[PDB]
Amino acid sequence: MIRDIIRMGDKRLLRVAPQVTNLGSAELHALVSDMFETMGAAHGVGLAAPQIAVDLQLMVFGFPAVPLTALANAQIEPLSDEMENGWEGCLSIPGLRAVIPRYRYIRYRGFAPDGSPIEREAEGFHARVVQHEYDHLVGRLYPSRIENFDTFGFDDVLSYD
Ligand X SMILES: Cc1nc(-c2cccc(N)c2)cs1
Tell me if 43 is assigned to a ligand binding site: no
C-alpha span between 160 and 155 (Å, rounded): 11
End-to-end Cα separation, the chain, in angstroms: 38
| Binding characters for ligand X, 87-126, by CB under 6 A (x = yes) | xxxx------x-----------------------------
From candidates 92, 126, 128, 135, binder to ligand X by CB under 6 A = 128
Tell me if 126 is assigned to a ligand binding site: no
Beta bridge partners of 75: 109
Binding partner at 11 among ligand X, a copy of itself, none, C-beta below 5 to 8 Å by kind: a copy of itself
Tell me if 132 is assigned to a ligand binding site: yes
Phi-psi domain of 126 (left: phi exceeds 0; alpha: psi -120 through 50; beta: other): alpha
27 is annotated as an active-site residue: no
Give residues in contact with a copy of itself (CB under 8 A). Answer: 6-11, 14, 96, 141, 143-144, 146, 149-150, 152-155, 157-160
